[PDB]
């Protein structure tokens, strides 16, 4: 029930002044003094003042007598402190806070000092690559470009997609001005059916848009190569067993052996092709081994010959790793 | 003016582990008179109000989790998590109110360390509307990956592209504690339609090789 | 009804300690004080000193001055010594017993100063060359091979059978573990009509066993299920692959089926199974994830299903593993 | 510190007769003041908590038979044993508590002497369970033998085997004085499946001829 609520964020002409508020509710405002905390962008928290409501008692901090003045109206139950002849030094955030005991804080107000003007930012979509593409998941957003000065504030589907969303932080750009992405990510299953758009809300200049990313407007295959080593669990036998995956090919024609030293292992055996939900074939190759030629850290490797290959063949070695 | 004085500067804790980060001022924070020692700790988490969790060097606020404890006198403190959670991933800040004006720490920065995480790399071309206006601008995006460190490299008609790109990276995730990055190749309408592909090379340490994702201009 | 119950044989690790306990039973614990005497590898005996419950007086031989720490715990029974800073020199038998005069002894603890950790003793059953291939009475045993430290204990149906029996000290084998035979002589008659049962226990690595030797012992083959992460190299693609391979398995017969929570997953292609070398068959199953939910730690798990196993359904978890 | 000395180190004496065992102390162990001898007897056999037989240098115990009596004042004890029996076959301690620290005697080891006992010989193959390990180890037991001496020679497909051996002799034998051993081979699942002919040849002193047992590979 006790709560801080400061003044919005706000641009400010060098050499100008401000004048941020507290407004004070859920208790008696002339029960504690309100305190101001300077906070420049990431660096340590510096304390300016404190104004007491109530006795209209006030200290402040020698660094900031002269650049900041507190005051406070009981009627209003809201505290103020008045920045004045800003500079570029003064851009920060600026928050106000309860008692000698800060349990309770505003949400901060961020005062830029710049010459420029605000601006509103203009809201591109980040179209998602394609249904099934993705076969699972895609990825999909906006892009909040050129506005002035901070805060943006992004949502999608108002409030609803929160799950996998990516607000980043905002860059300031050569040009003068703030850029922003936010991504989610979302099943590709739903893309196409599920509408998403975002909330894009930058107060500074009263701009409000929701832009509705929708999916954009629109033969051999190398196979690819991964060996696995033996389930730690198979290392309970003796004799392991080494895997070469080849999946994401086409055509269905393909040759896979394995080799050791100069001289080429024998006991293994391929699984036959098999169609990937994708249109390409994958199958998978397993070399046996006695599990003491496989600790004494040889080297195995899986060759594939396939048509789609540079020279219609490629080896992917595999051995016992020493890890830290 | 009394000083504040945190260590370490950041830390790197596994879920579970247990951590103590220190805070020392230069004069001290324990009046005689009450045997009391004037002294807070502070969780501040991106972009938001700061937290007071311990008051009095070790008074655990109402709804602050046992997992947190301060102890200290005089001019040395310390503010320990037992079992360290997702959560507990923010900044922790020290401040004396012994005398004014009130002084705080430079703080420091809770990591959680989580397993290497390789990036998911996505690439997103400009849109019309946004041709219309006489800029391209590209995004790739980095997905939930771990350690921090990260690099994208543009490629535009197989060329190496330099100081026209920018990139954004996350607060490291509440629950699965990976960080996300995205960076914007930004060029004119006029650049972007007199190349043709448009390539971006993502290189991080959970990836074996360079791993790259692209797109040529024409191409639906 | 006196007794003197000593703790458990352990290893130590050089320049770690120990702290044996005795446990009196059977008499007034204050009565009589409780010595500690070593012995050292089969050899000598040395007397430590001794500690008097009732009074705490107590005294020392001064050569374990500074490596012993005889105590008491009047209410617990008890008297412990405690052995600071081992060395080789203190691998040896510890032994408490009551009073000057030493009628009641403990059954001593043997400590083992070494950087091997303790192993668990595997037991393989020694069988009687048959039915009067030995005449009119034949022999049995129980193999108790690789595991450390000693000492382990043998018995024969649970204390029944005594007569007869031949425990052979264990030996140290090259591969640095204890290995040990215990043999007992039975008439062919009762071979075969009566059980025979050798109960091994090895409480240093809590591991009791109960081999039954049987006389020798002269179509479906259970599937062995092991679960292999994505490759290294897979891993720079959105979308990775977890693999399942069932192999040794007979008849061709089989159902493998993968899933998450409490929700099945989908995504998936199991290959046709494959003739193996050895006449069993194999395959793999390959469900498709996106890379995301891998690295988010969830456990995957492949149920496999099968005449041959034990309720025909088994299932093997796998998931990001936290390596060091 | 007093210092006890036993004769002799050890001792082979024939089921009936009759020792002496002598123990020696480097100060005297008499008592002016009660006239008491302050010595005392221990049996110990293998891996067990010794025995007291006699106390105060000739007061045998509750349960020590009457074969067994203590004699000896002031520097020089013994004990005797009138009639040997087979489950005397022990170690004999004796151990002054006159004064601190308490000290004992090397000790005496007593073996029985008996008739020649020629070993019983079998012969065991490698469980099925072992041999999924990876490993074959084949045992061969020589039963309730007498002279001690004995030898076993294993042979794989009539080869002789050399180096990768291992025996292990029990005690003598409380009841029939005899001995035990047990001679295991061990070679690799590999090594082990690759030869046919399992051979293993005694060879004692009550054999009139070598002995051998022996197993073709097979389930039967």
């Known amino acids: 029930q006790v709560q801080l609520v400061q003044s919005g964020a706000e641009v400010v002409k060098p050499g100008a002044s401000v004048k941020i508020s507290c407004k004070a509710s859920?208790?008696?405002?002339?029960?504690?003094?309100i305190h101001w905390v300077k906070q420049n962008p990431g660096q340590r928290l510096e304390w300016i003042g404190y104004?007491?409501?109530?006795?209209?008692?006030?200290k402040y901090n020698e660094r900031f007598k002269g650049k900041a003045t507190l005051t406070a109206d009981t009627s209003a139950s809201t505290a103020y402190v008045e920045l004045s002849s800003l500079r570029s030094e003064d851009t920060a955030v600026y928050f106000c806070?309860?008692?000698?005991?800060?349990?309770?804080w505003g949400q901060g107000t961020l005062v830029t000092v710049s010459s420029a003007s605000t601006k509103g930012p203009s809201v591109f979509p980040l179209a998602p690559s394609s249904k099934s593409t993705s076969g699972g998941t895609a990825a999909l957003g906006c892009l909040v470009k050129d506005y002035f000065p901070e805060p943006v504030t992004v949502s999608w589907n108002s409030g609803a997609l929160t799950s996998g969303v990516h607000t980043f932080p905002a860059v300031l750009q050569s040009s003068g001005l703030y850029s922003l992405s936010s991504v989610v990510t979302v099943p590709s299953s739903s893309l196409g059916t599920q509408t998403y758009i975002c909330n894009v809300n930058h107060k500074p200049s009263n701009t409000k848009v929701d832009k509705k990313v929708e999916p954009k407007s629109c033969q051999p295959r190398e196979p690819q190569v991964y060996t696995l080593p033996p389930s730690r669990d198979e290392l309970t036998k003796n004799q392991v067993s080494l895997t070469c995956l080849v999946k994401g090919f086409y055509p269905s024609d393909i040759a896979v052996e394995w080799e050791s030293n100069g001289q080429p292992e024998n006991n293994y055996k391929t699984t036959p092709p098999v169609l990937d939900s994708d249109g390409s074939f994958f199958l998978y190759s397993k070399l046996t081994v006695d599990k003491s030629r496989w600790q004494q850290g040889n080297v195995f490797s899986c060759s594939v010959m396939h048509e789609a290959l540079h020279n219609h063949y490629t080896q992917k070695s595999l051995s016992l790793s020493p890890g830290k | 003016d009394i000083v504040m004085s945190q260590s370490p500067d950041s830390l790197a804790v596994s879920l579970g582990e247990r951590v103590t980060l220190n805070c020392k001022s230069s004069?001290?924070?324990?009046?005689?008179?009450?045997?009391?020692?004037?002294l807070a700790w502070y969780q501040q988490k991106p972009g938001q109000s700061p937290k007071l969790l311990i008051y009095?060097?070790?008074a655990r606020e109402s709804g602050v989790p046992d997992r947190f404890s301060g102890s200290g006198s005089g001019t040395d403190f310390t503010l320990t998590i037992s079992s360290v959670q997702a959560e507990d991933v923010a900044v922790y800040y020290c401040?004396?109110?012994?005398?004014?004006?009130?002084?705080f720490g430079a703080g420091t920065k809770l990591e959680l360390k989580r397993t290497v995480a390789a990036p998911s790399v996505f690439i997103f071309p400009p849109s019309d509307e946004q041709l219309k206006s006489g800029t391209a601008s590209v995004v790739c995006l980095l997905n939930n990956f771990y350690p921090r460190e990260a690099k994208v490299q543009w490629k535009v008609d197989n060329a190496l592209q330099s100081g026209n790109s920018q990139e954004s990276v996350t607060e490291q995730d509440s629950k699965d504690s990976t960080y996300s990055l995205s960076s914007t190749l930004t060029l004119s309408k006029a650049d972007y339609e007199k190349h043709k592909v448009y390539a971006c090379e993502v290189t991080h340490q959970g990836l074996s090789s360079p791993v790259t994702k692209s797109f040529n201009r024409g191409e639906c | 009804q006196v007794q003197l119950v000593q703790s458990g044989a352990e290893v130590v690790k050089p320049g770690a300690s120990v702290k044996i306990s005795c446990?009196?039973?059977?008499?007034?614990?204050?009565?009589?004080?409780?010595?500690?005497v070593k012995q050292n590898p089969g050899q000598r005996l040395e007397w430590?000193?001794?500690?008097?419950?009732?009074?705490?007086?107590?005294?020392?031989?001064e050569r374990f001055k500074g490596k012993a720490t005889l105590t008491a715990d009047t209410s617990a029974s008890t008297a412990y010594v405690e052995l600071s800073s081992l060395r080789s020199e203190d691998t040896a038998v510890?032994?408490?017993?009551?009073?000057?005069?030493?009628?009641?002894?403990?059954?001593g603890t043997l400590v083992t100063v070494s950087s091997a950790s303790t192993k668990g003793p595997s037991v393989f059953p020694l069988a009687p060359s048959s039915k009067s291939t030995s005449g009119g009475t034949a022999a049995l045993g129980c193999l108790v091979k690789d595991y450390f430290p000693e000492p382990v204990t043998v018995s024969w149906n649970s204390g029944a059978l005594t007569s007869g029996v031949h425990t052979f000290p264990a030996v140290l084998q090259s591969s640095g573990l204890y290995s040990l035979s215990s043999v007992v002589t039975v008439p062919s008659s009762s071979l075969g009509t009566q059980t025979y049962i050798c109960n091994v226990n090895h409480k240093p690595s809590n591991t009791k066993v109960d081999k039954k030797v049987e006389p020798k012992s002269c179509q479906p083959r259970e599937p062995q299920v092991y679960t292999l992460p994505p490759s290294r190299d897979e891993l720079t693609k959105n979308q990775v692959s977890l693999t399942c391979l069932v192999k040794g398995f007979y008849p061709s017969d089989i159902a493998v089926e993968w899933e998450s929570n409490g929700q099945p997953e989908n995504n998936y292609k199991t290959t046709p199974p494959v003739l193996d070398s050895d006449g069993s068959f194999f395959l793999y199953s390959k469900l498709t994830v996106d890379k995301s939910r891998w690295q988010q730690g969830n456990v995957f798990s492949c149920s496999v299903m099968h005449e041959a196993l034990h309720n025909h359904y088994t299932q093997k978890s796998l998931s990001l593993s936290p390596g060091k | 510190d007093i210092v006890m000395s036993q004769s002799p180190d050890s001792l082979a004496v024939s089921l009936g007769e009759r020792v002496t065992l002598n123990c020696?102390?480097?100060?005297?162990?008499?008592?002016?003041?009660?006239?008491?001898?302050?010595?005392?007897?221990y049996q110990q056999k293998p891996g067990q908590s010794p025995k007291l037989?006699?106390?105060?240098?000739?007061?045998?115990?509750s349960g020590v038979p009457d074969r067994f009596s203590g004699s000896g004042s002031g520097t020089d004890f013994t004990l005797t044993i009138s009639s040997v029996q087979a489950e005397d076959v022990a170690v004999?301690?004796?151990?002054?508590?006159?004064?601190?620290?308490?000290?004992?005697?090397?000790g005496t080891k007593l073996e029985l002497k008996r008739t020649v006992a020629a070993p019983s010989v079998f012969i065991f193959p490698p469980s099925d369970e072992q041999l999924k390990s990876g490993t074959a180890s084949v045992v061969c037991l020589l039963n309730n033998f007498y002279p001690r001496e004995a030898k076993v020679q294993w042979k794989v497909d009539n080869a002789l085997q050399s180096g990768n051996s291992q025996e292990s002799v029990t005690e003598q034998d409380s009841k029939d004085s005899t001995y035990s051993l047990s001679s295991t081979l061990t070679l690799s699942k590999a090594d082990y499946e690759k030869h046919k002919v399992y051979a293993c040849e005694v060879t004692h002193q009550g054999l009139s001829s070598p002995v051998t047992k022996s197993f073709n590979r097979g389930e039967c």
């Open positions: 401040q004396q109110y012994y005398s004014y004006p009130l002084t």
């Open positions: 806070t309860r008692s000698l005991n800060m349990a309770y």
């Open positions: 004069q001290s924070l324990l009046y005689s008179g009450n045997q009391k020692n004037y």
């Open positions: 009095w060097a070790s």
């Open positions: 104004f007491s409501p109530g006795n209209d008692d006030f």
């Open positions: 859920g208790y008696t405002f002339t029960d504690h003094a």
